[PDB]
Structures are given as C-alpha cells and as structure tokens.
Amino acid sequence: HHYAMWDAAYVLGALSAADRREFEAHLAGCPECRGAVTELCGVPALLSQLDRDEVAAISESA
Amino acid sequence: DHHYAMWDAAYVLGALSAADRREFEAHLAGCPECRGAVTELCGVPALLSQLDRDEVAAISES
Amino acid sequence: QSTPDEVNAALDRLLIADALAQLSAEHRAVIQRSYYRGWSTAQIATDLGIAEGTVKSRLHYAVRALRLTLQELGVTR
Amino acid sequence: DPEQSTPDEVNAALDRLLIADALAQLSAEHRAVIQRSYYRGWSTAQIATDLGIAEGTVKSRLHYAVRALRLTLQELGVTR
Ligand SMILES: [Zn+2]
Ligand SMILES: [Zn+2]
C-alpha cells in the first residue's frame, strides 16, 4: 500500500490539500501508518530550530 | 494526575527545552496515552506552517 | 487558469487564518509565541508573567481548541 | 526574545549545532527534499518539477530522508 510512504510528507506539511485529506482518511483506518506518523511527529519540532538560510548554507557548503 | 499529559502540544510545537524534550520522549516510550495524544496533534504543525508569523502577528493585533 | 490544487491551497490558508482568528486571545497568544516566534516554554512564562506549567496546559488546550475549529471548518478530518 | 537561563541558552545552541550536523550528514538528495518541503514550504508536485522525478518518488524520497535524519539525530543524542 503506497500510503506507508506518505508519513514524512504529511508530517512535514508537503501534502497538497487533496492528498492530505486522502491520507487523513487512510490514517483513521490504518494503525501502521498511524504508528509511522507517531514515530516522526517530533521531527518538525527539531527542524524548526534552524532557519532556511542556515540550511541553505549547509547545502552550498557540502 | 499525571502531569506529562499537558506536554503534548508544547512537544509537537517545538516549545520544550532540550531537557524537557528528553524527559517527555522518555515518558512517551512508556505511556500509550501520551502517544495517542501526540499522534492526534501531529498534523497541526503542518497546518500552522501554511501561514507566516507576520500574517499571524497582524491577526493578533487585530 | 487557477489549478485545482492552488485553489484548494488558497482555501485552506483562508480557513486556517480564520480558525486562528476564532481562538480566545490567551490561546492565540501561546500558539503565536511557541510556533511562530519559536519561543521555549520558559520564555513564554517569563513574557506572560505566568507559571511554566500553566504555559504547557494552556498550550495543550489552545491547540486542541484550534483543532476543533479546523475540523468544523473542514480543514482536517 | 525573552531572556533564558544560561543552561537553557547553551543547550539550545548545542541542539542547533547537532541538528545542523545531522542535516549536513544527509546525502545531497535527502537534504534537497527536506530543504524544499520544510524550509521552503513547497508541495510534492512543485518539488517533483524542480528536481526532475515523479511525485510518488518525492514522497518516498522524503520518507527515507526523514527516517535517515532521525537515525543520525538519535545517534547524536538529540532525540530518543
Ligand atoms: Zn497505512
Ligand atoms: Zn503519559
């Protein structure tokens, strides 16, 4: 089931509005996906400690 | 009657200190209730991220 | 000329703004300070002159209130 | 921003240090999708066009990108 791959997109806010509702619907009846998002829900909080500029500098600088 | 139940929002919003975040992740490893709580709240950041802090400040001033 | 997805995105942005406008002032304040300003629990406490524990529970209720609105508005299920 | 205690101030700086380190350790492709979705606010469709891959592949690539990031973050002591 292709949904399993949607966890990160969902938690990062990258799902279009139609995909987001599709996934939220799937989540209500899929304990696996539900547990997947739960594993990742702490990640946006960590990502938010840096600004996009800091991040861009990390890229240019690889 | 367990204080950790109030930390779910601060956790998902990124507002817990490094220390507070560790305690809470520790508690999460053993509390299915708090896990269900953060799971419910985890689409929230993605929704919030669709607006900038400037729009939001404007709204709060009025 | 508007793509179906940019239309839906535009709608969601209106509704989320709208949902944030419907929060009580106290709920909007803690959400604004944690998520949008990136402040810690302790900093929010200092700035508001309330206890840290109160900031946490207040954030707890505020996020849940936001969500109730966003559900009624149809933004999230 | 309000004043924080000295420990809070240092710990948060340490955290930002490790998080940055973790992202630098991502492969270029994993960092590329994380930068576009989270930092730039882009949608999968938009990322698909800029990067030159199918949207379904943007999704799965993000899935692996975030899981890899997490691995490093755990190894690094930032999250359990
Ligand atoms: Zn599933
Ligand atoms: Zn608990």
Author numbering:
A (entry chain B): 25 to 86
B (entry chain D): 24 to 85
C (entry chain C): 101 to 177
D (entry chain A): 98 to 177
Please give the exact wording used by the authors of the publication that reports this structure.
The activity of σ factors is often regulated by their association with an anti-σ factor. Mtb RslA is a ZAS protein with a cytosolic domain (ASD) that interacts with the ECF σ factor σL and a membrane-spanning C-terminal domain. With in vitro transcription assays, the anti-σ factor of σL, RslA, was shown to inhibit σL-dependent transcription of the σB gene in a dose-dependent manner. RslA responds to oxidative stimuli with the release of the Zn2+ cofactor, followed by the formation of a disulfide link between proximal cysteines of the HXXXCXXC motif.
In this arrangement, five heterotetramers of the σ4L/RslA complex pack with a 5-fold symmetry to form a ring-like structure, with the zinc binding region of RslA facing the center of the ring. The 1:1 stoichiometry for the σ4L/RslA complex seen in the crystal structure is consistent with biochemical data. σ4L forms a tight complex with RslA involving a buried surface area of ca 1332 Å2. The crystal structure shows that the orientation of domains in the σ4L/RslA complex is different from that in Rsp ChrR, the only other structurally characterized ZAS–σ factor complex. Unlike Rsp ChrR, no structural rearrangements were seen in σ4L upon RslA binding.
